[PDB]
Amino acid sequence: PAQAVVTLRYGPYSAVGLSVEHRTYRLQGLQAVLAKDGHQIILEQIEDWNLVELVVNEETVFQCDIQELEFGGDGKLDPLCEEARIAVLNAF
Amino acid sequence: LQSEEIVAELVYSFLIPEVQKDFVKEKVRNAQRKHILAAHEIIHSNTET
Amino acid sequence: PTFDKKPLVWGEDLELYSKFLDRKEQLRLSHASYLRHHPEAQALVSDFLLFLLLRRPEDVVTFAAEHFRPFAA
Amino acid sequence: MAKFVIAGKANCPYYAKAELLADYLQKNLPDFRIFKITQHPDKWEDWVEDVCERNMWDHRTSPIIWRELLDRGGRGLLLGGYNEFLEHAQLYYGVTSNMTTELMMVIAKENMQTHTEQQLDKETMKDLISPLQVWIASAGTYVCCHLIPLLLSGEVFGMHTEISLTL
Helix, strand or coil, X not given: CCCCEEEEEECCEECCCCCEECCCXXXXXXXXXXXXXXXXXXXXXXXXXXXXXXXXXXXXXXXXXXXXXXXXXXXXXXXXXXXXXXXXXXXX | CHHHHHXXXXXXXXXXXXXXXXXXXXXXXXHHHHHHXXXXXXXXXXXXX | CCCXXXXXXXXXXXXXHHHHHHHHHHHHHHHHHHHXXXXXXXXXXXXXXXXXXXXXCCCHHHHHHXXXXXXXX | CXXXXXEEECCCHHHHHHHHHHHHHHHHCCCEEXXXXXXXXXXXXXXXXXXXXXXXXXXXXXXXXXXXXXXXXXCEEEECCHHHHHHHHHXXXXXXXXXXXXXXXXHHHHHHHHHHHHHHHHHHHHHCCCCEEEECCCCCCHHHHHHHHHHHCCXXXXXXXXXXXEC
């Protein structure tokens, strides 16, 4: 619900020119969105590259490649972040 | 002019990956050094020969 | 004077060989994660292998095909 | 000396925020150079599609971002829309943009007004104009060569004449 308890799982990726690693910055935007919607979220470093998953009830439905997201800010203009918000609401 | 651009692209785009790859191999070598020291530890017991 | 278009093995170009290694690891982990989404692929083989080694028939291919064909639609 | 270009729509939030990041980088970094472009959004689609075809890139969203290898208007190497440039700046430089979304709205207005300024400036240049109009018939003739320098002397009129000539 409102103020869900949640886990986020995130996979390591090569930034342009750069090593494949776990990274947060677009995810930090997503985290900010989820927190503003009200929720408690925990972050998990999945081995599978670049990938983003969203978990509640142990049940999981999300998929993204980190680079698909907007970088930083409230992400309000990124449609995908609203799609995540919708999916969270639907999870309730 | 063409060669100048082409190789400028090549070097520029390569060198950053080269640095990242090197630092990765630094940590890979750190793992290898772990293995090498494990071998060294057993090598003490190997002195029984 | 002598002339050639020398064919290069990727090992000869550090840049290409690096790209090769990176792609290799990327694929390797891709396949791993793919099976990790589909553990059932591993699980079926594992079960067959287990009952095989319990039985230890030397024609592995007979025993496995005997398990697989009953699954066959 | 690194050289970058970014193209914008006057309304684009992320292009404006890119402008902020660019000016930050160019101010603080000795190394950094950037040139600035923006189109009216209607023009933008065509202009960018032309650029992308020439490069054989494949980018559509404003902004678009690329590094030009030697000089202004060389061949480019493509960076992605705003998130990719921010990523590049953060990782390579360590830098962070700090601007608010609300600020991006305001500056989106400011840049709309800036494009309106550009348009009015175009119109303003039309106002400045007071030439003298000259025509020459049968101009393709040997006399014409000798004549033109005497016209250009200005003594014909005084050295105070905006001259426009036709042949």
